[PDB]
Amino acid sequence: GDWSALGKLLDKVQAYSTAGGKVWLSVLFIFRILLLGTAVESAWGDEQSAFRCNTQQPGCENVCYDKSFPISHVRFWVLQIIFVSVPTLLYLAHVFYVMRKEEKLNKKEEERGGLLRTYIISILFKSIFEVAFLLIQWYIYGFSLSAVYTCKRDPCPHQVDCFLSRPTEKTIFIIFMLVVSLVSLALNIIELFYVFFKGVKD
Amino acid sequence: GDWSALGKLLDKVQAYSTAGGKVWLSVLFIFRILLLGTAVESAWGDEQSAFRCNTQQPGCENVCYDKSFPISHVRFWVLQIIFVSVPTLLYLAHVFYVMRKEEKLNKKEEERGGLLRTYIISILFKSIFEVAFLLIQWYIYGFSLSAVYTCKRDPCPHQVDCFLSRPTEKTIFIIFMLVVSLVSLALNIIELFYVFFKGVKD
Amino acid sequence: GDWSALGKLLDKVQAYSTAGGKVWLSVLFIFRILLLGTAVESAWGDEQSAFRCNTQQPGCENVCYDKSFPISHVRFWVLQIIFVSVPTLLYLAHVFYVMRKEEKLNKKEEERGGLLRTYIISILFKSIFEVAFLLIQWYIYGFSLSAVYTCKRDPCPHQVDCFLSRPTEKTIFIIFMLVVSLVSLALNIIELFYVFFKGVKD
Amino acid sequence: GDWSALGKLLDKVQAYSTAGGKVWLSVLFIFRILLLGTAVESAWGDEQSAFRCNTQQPGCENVCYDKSFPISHVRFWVLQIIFVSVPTLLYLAHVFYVMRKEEKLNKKEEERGGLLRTYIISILFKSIFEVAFLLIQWYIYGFSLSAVYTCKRDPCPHQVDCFLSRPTEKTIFIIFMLVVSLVSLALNIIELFYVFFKGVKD
Amino acid sequence: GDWSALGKLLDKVQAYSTAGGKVWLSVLFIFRILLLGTAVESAWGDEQSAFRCNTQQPGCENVCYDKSFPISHVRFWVLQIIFVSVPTLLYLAHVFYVMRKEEKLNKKEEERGGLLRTYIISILFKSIFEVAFLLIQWYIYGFSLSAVYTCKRDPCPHQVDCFLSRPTEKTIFIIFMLVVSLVSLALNIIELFYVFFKGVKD
Amino acid sequence: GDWSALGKLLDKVQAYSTAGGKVWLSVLFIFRILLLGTAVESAWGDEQSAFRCNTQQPGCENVCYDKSFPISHVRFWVLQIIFVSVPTLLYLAHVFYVMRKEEKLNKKEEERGGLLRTYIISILFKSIFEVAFLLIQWYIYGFSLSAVYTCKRDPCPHQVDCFLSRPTEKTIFIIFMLVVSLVSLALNIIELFYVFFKGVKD
Ligand SMILES: CC(C)CCC[C@@H](C)[C@H]1CC[C@H]2[C@@H]3CC=C4C[C@@H](OC(=O)CCC(=O)O)CC[C@]4(C)[C@H]3CC[C@]12C
Ligand SMILES: CC(C)CCC[C@@H](C)[C@H]1CC[C@H]2[C@@H]3CC=C4C[C@@H](OC(=O)CCC(=O)O)CC[C@]4(C)[C@H]3CC[C@]12C
Ligand SMILES: CC(C)CCC[C@@H](C)[C@H]1CC[C@H]2[C@@H]3CC=C4C[C@@H](OC(=O)CCC(=O)O)CC[C@]4(C)[C@H]3CC[C@]12C
Ligand SMILES: CC(C)CCC[C@@H](C)[C@H]1CC[C@H]2[C@@H]3CC=C4C[C@@H](OC(=O)CCC(=O)O)CC[C@]4(C)[C@H]3CC[C@]12C
Ligand SMILES: CC(C)CCC[C@@H](C)[C@H]1CC[C@H]2[C@@H]3CC=C4C[C@@H](OC(=O)CCC(=O)O)CC[C@]4(C)[C@H]3CC[C@]12C
Ligand SMILES: CC(C)CCC[C@@H](C)[C@H]1CC[C@H]2[C@@H]3CC=C4C[C@@H](OC(=O)CCC(=O)O)CC[C@]4(C)[C@H]3CC[C@]12C
Ligand SMILES: CC(C)CCC[C@@H](C)[C@H]1CC[C@H]2[C@@H]3CC=C4C[C@@H](OC(=O)CCC(=O)O)CC[C@]4(C)[C@H]3CC[C@]12C
């Protein structure tokens, strides 16, 4: 049970990458998924059951929660990490099929090119998605949470004060994820610069 | 432990497919199942416990919820994704048995045809199911949710106002799924056009 | 790691079956288990917590629920699908042991029969169980659910109105399962007719 | 990856068994564990939360529940199925070690007996445990449940009426398990009779 | 895929053990983990939600529960079973590394001792931990539970009566675990006596 | 299926380590993860639902809980154990790639150094993280919990007394984790001293 075809595929996929990029970028993905699945996912469990508002009006809590949180952070991060990893899978499948076709051609008729361009495009799109998600998060929420929220949506009469759950831990986790995203963006830009320098000097 | 029979089966199954269809259509299924299982399934958890109506009448909440939501979106999508994937499994089993029979025939007696038609039929049925589900969803619900619902079902007296849970996130997820379905439909139609052009020109 | 003994066992088990029966009957089992485990099992979760009755008498809700639902549909279906699949497992084990004994005999002493009857018996019993379960379900419940139930069991005084949870989705799922069961019954009867015709003409 | 040592161990373990016992007794274990893990385990979930008594005295519900149910049925059945399966595992380990020692002896010094007795003892103990558990269950509970219970334990004043959850489904499952246990006992006694007849006639 | 190195490691690890100890001690661990994970873990679920005290003072329930149960039984048993199994893992790793080093030495330079002492030390420490845990449990709790508890901790005024959940089942499980622990201790002492007798007579 | 490349990688990774460090440090990680995942994670489940304060003011409980527990202990420990294990994974990947490159070089052109420095750096960083986390925990919380907390945050009027859940078990687990961390730190420092002594004397 020798896993040599996996080695061939891995070597072909990582032909144009640097030595460092083969390590940090791979470990960061594992770090990200572990942190997302273990710690943060449980702090957001009681985000609506422990949300309280000061009023007797039936229906103000629902509308005020929907106004405060149009989309939860955890699902935003899940979307972010899904959109960032699909280009690599597409490239891997492309390489797999190309290798199979080349092997068939070699066995049948013996009885720098497109791949670099695809690699560059994938690396560009990953950074584009990172920047877009960061900008959207900055515009909608920010990078902090306050304990008291003021609601002025009907049928609440003239105003309402509402109180959040765990507004301090979530800030810490938000900052952690921001740092991780910035590190990933920098590591992805370095690869583009290296590739273009190699392609220009020679 | 060489997995060569899997390669033979894969090559036989994807004989008439294009180069692109071998990649995007496969990755889209993984994207779909991951998104369905991770993010959306948790937003619909408190769909009946956090549903509130303004009245003292016992029994109005149950009937009004049943009137508003005859069937949840998540289970509708589960049915949609199950009905779209069975034709491929049937075709795969058919090819498996045909290959086994051909091998037996070759070993025993040496001591464009039906498969294309089945492929075309499967591709047609997948698109048919996609369109049918989209039309049903458009007729029953639409592609948005409102925060306030008006109920006029007995025993509620003369009318009742009821309030939903997370009416903004669900709209976002609905739009995402709509886009995914449209992309899948287009990618399936392209294959039919390509196959018919190849079969007509030659 | 060649899986050839599995192939021998599979060919021996499916010797008397038709070409179609090797595909539809196998896929239907997967469809059934997936649908049972994913969608329906979650709709029946709040079947007793969201069941409400109009009264102040302590104890009427419990007795009225027990009177309305002597046994839940999901567990009835689990029993149905367990009782329908055991004959095949028994036949498979029988074939396995017979093959081992035949191999031992061949190696030791060289230093249409019972199996058809067992196959017929198993196919008969599967249909018998299907019909029995369908008849019991028809007699006890029917194939629909109503939103309001009338209870006349002690200690409830003179009568009580009670209200169910999700009475419309469950009807849809009931109809789905009924259709699946009918399809399975028809596909099983076809095999008996084919076998008897082959055994009579030759 | 040929699994021949597993075959040798299986043949050695089942040397003195009948043809039928190799099939029904093995399938019954799978049936038992599936039924225990899928259906019954969920019906007993709300056994204490939905238990209600008619009184204002704080503490009567706890003591009356503890008096009605000294031990739940599901855990009783788990103990029953654990105590019935350990002798076979002990015998299997004994055979494994004996085979290893015999192989070592054969390679080193070539440079009806105890096993039957152990088999008989294990078969006897399995039936003994079955009978003991059945008798205990008959003495403590019976084979049915009633909807209303009468409690006369302090601090409840002079008497209390309490009401159970799902008293009709549980009776059905109890009867099912009783039938399964009786079938297992009969199948185990048959093996003893067969073994003793073979050992006496020859 | 022959698993011969596993056999070598197993034979080396169990060189000084008796015939019986290779069976009962191994099966007892499986029995213990199964019983701990299946039955008992669910009876302790509602240990604080169903705990009730007779008073209106806010805060007496929390302090009285903390006074009654400084540590739950299930977690005590988890610690007990973890502390008893680590010496064997350490010894196994030691043997693994020693065997690798010996193989390297044999291939390089051909181009009763410490292990017994380690075995004895491990066997001693297992019994020491068993006895220590039993003594601590006897001192803190005992081997039974009563339904009514009397609390005299502030801010409760002058006294309070509190009521437990399932005080009869837990006694049964406690007795079961006590018996298992005693059996394990005896089986471990037998090995020490056998080893010392063999080492003294010869 | 011989796992010899795993052996080569393991021997290369642990070339500069002592004999003891190959055992205790590996077993301690398993001990840590088992203890974290089995016992402690369930004691912190009802940390906010069972937290109670004496007042009628809506919103004081949320703010007072957020003030008492800026971050839960379990998630702090998860972060601690994640930050301590990434350097080893980075070093392992580095060694893997270096070995592959060396093999390629050997096959192509035949048709104490950096690794020690990386090992030292990783060992230093692990201890640095341990010390930093211990200091932060000491500064923020301490190593004990009290049953009564005094809150002076708005909108609570002038003061509030609040009561915690399970304040005695958590102290025990905190002490356990502290001891484990200290042991790990000592075992890591020993390796640095040994390495430097070997590098200086020779
Ligand atoms: C549900 C299962 C069947 C499919 C889901 C898993 C895949 C989507 C995984 C398998 C390997 C993963 C990759 C492993 C590591 C990397 C690190 C990083 O890529 C790199 O830069 C690697 C270094 C390099 O090649 O230069 C970005 C994420 C990525 C591609 C991962 C993206 C997600 C991948 C493709
Ligand atoms: C529970 C387990 C035992 C069975 C359930 C899994 C199957 C139903 C999976 C295995 C592979 C899956 C397929 C993998 C990828 C594709 C992509 C797509 O098909 C294609 O067009 C592939 C590209 C081509 O062949 O042209 C539509 C879904 C489909 C068939 C998937 C449908 C679901 C399949 C058959
Ligand atoms: C927990 C694990 C170890 C055992 C539980 C799984 C088995 C009970 C499964 C394995 C394969 C399954 C079978 C696979 C497919 C078929 C389709 C169908 O049988 C057929 O008619 C197959 C076609 C034919 O042979 O003619 C009825 C169910 C059955 C026998 C399934 C019944 C359940 C089986 C035996
Ligand atoms: C957690 C894992 C690692 C161990 C737990 C599983 C075992 C305890 C299983 C493996 C195979 C099982 C056995 C498979 C089938 C049989 C049927 C039956 O035994 C027979 O009579 C078999 C027929 C015969 O040999 O005559 C009684 C239960 C028993 C021994 C089972 C008892 C439980 C066993 C030993
Ligand atoms: C019942 C027995 C006879 C067989 C079943 C147990 C084995 C599978 C155990 C015994 C010794 C274990 C090994 C002992 C020590 C280590 C710890 C660990 O060592 C490392 O590689 C540390 C990582 C690093 O090098 O930095 C990796 C797993 C490994 C090889 C263990 C793998 C599993 C082993 C082989
Ligand atoms: C999470 C995974 C990767 C590691 C956790 C599992 C181990 C800690 C297991 C593997 C085998 C187990 C052992 C299997 C059986 C025995 C029986 C018993 O030891 C004996 O006396 C065996 C008989 C003998 O050798 O004399 C005490 C527990 C012990 C060592 C077990 C302790 C726990 C062990 C080492
Ligand atoms: C989700 C899966 C795919 C990846 C997550 C698991 C890894 C991060 C594991 C695999 C082996 C583990 C290691 C096994 C044992 C050790 C013991 C210890 O390292 C040692 O000192 C080993 C002894 C030595 O080499 O001197 C510190 C933790 C470490 C490196 C572990 C850190 C976590 C590791 C790398």
Side-chain angles (χ1 to χ4, degrees), chain E residues 109-184:
Chain E
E109 296 294 349
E110 302 296 349
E111 187 177 351
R112 299 183 173 278
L115 298 177
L116 186 59
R117 192 168 60 108
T118 57
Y119 183 78
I120 295 169
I121 294 169
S122 173
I123 299 289
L124 287 173
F125 269 87
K126 289 163 66 179
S127 299
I128 285 170
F129 287 150
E130 285 283 18
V131 172
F133 275 94
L134 282 170
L135 293 174
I136 296 175
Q137 186 179 351
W138 173 81
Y139 183 70
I140 299 296
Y141 284 119
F143 301 99
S144 179
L145 286 180
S146 299
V148 186
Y149 178 77
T150 308
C151 185
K152 190 179 176 60
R153 186 177 176 184
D154 291 323
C156 316
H158 302 309
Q159 252 159 1
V160 161
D161 279 0
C162 298
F163 308 90
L164 283 59
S165 177
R166 307 173 191 257
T168 305
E169 209 173 13
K170 302 179 175 180
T171 305
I172 302 172
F173 287 135
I174 292 159
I175 292 173
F176 269 102
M177 302 303 284
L178 173 68
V179 173
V180 176
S181 304
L182 294 176
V183 171
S184 182

Side-chain angles (χ1 to χ4, degrees), chain A:
Chain A
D2 60 324
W3 302 7
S4 179
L6 279 299
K8 275 182 72 65
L9 191 68
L10 184 69
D11 292 331
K12 194 71 182 301
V13 167
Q14 300 175 340
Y16 301 104
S17 297
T18 60
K22 295 181 177 76
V23 183
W24 303 87
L25 238 34
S26 300
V27 174
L28 192 129
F29 177 81
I30 294 166
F31 185 100
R32 222 175 186 175
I33 58 169
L34 285 176
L35 191 66
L36 191 64
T38 41
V40 313
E41 187 246 335
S42 54
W44 264 265
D46 58 359
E47 55 176 341
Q48 183 171 19
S49 63
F51 184 95
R52 279 134 198 169
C53 298
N54 185 339
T55 183
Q56 285 180 353
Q57 187 66 32
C60 184
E61 269 186 8
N62 303 61
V63 302
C64 293
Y65 171 90
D66 182 61
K67 189 169 182 265
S68 183
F69 297 110
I71 185 171
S72 179
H73 293 79
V74 288
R75 319 200 175 91
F76 192 81
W77 294 330
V78 170
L79 288 174
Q80 181 177 7
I81 190 175
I82 285 177
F83 273 77
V84 169
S85 300
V86 63
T88 305
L89 196 59
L90 294 164
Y91 183 59
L92 230 153
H94 181 243
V95 169
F96 177 83
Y97 284 109
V98 164
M99 290 173 56
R100 283 189 66 89
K101 178 171 66 181
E102 280 183 356
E103 295 173 9
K104 285 202 309 183
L105 177 69
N106 298 129
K107 284 291 171 296
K108 184 181 69 175
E109 296 294 349
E110 302 296 349
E111 187 177 351
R112 299 183 173 278
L115 298 177
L116 186 59
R117 192 168 60 108
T118 57
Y119 183 78
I120 295 169
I121 294 169
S122 173
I123 299 289
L124 287 173
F125 269 87
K126 290 163 66 179
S127 299
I128 285 170
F129 287 150
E130 285 283 18
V131 172
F133 275 94
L134 282 170
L135 293 174
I136 296 175
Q137 186 179 351
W138 173 81
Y139 183 70
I140 299 296
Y141 284 119
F143 301 99
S144 179
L145 286 180
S146 300
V148 186
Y149 178 77
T150 308
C151 186
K152 190 179 176 60
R153 186 177 176 184
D154 291 323
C156 316
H158 302 309
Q159 252 159 1
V160 161
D161 279 0
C162 298
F163 308 90
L164 283 58
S165 177
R166 308 173 191 257
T168 305
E169 209 173 13
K170 302 179 175 180
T171 305
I172 302 172
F173 287 135
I174 292 159
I175 292 173
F176 269 102
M177 302 303 284
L178 173 68
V179 173
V180 176
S181 304
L182 294 176
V183 171
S184 182
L185 182 68
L187 287 178
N188 272 274
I189 284 170
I190 288 172
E191 294 289 334
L192 282 164
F193 277 21
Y194 171 90
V195 161
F196 274 137
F197 266 52
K198 274 196 72 174
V200 164
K201 302 314 185 184
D202 299 71

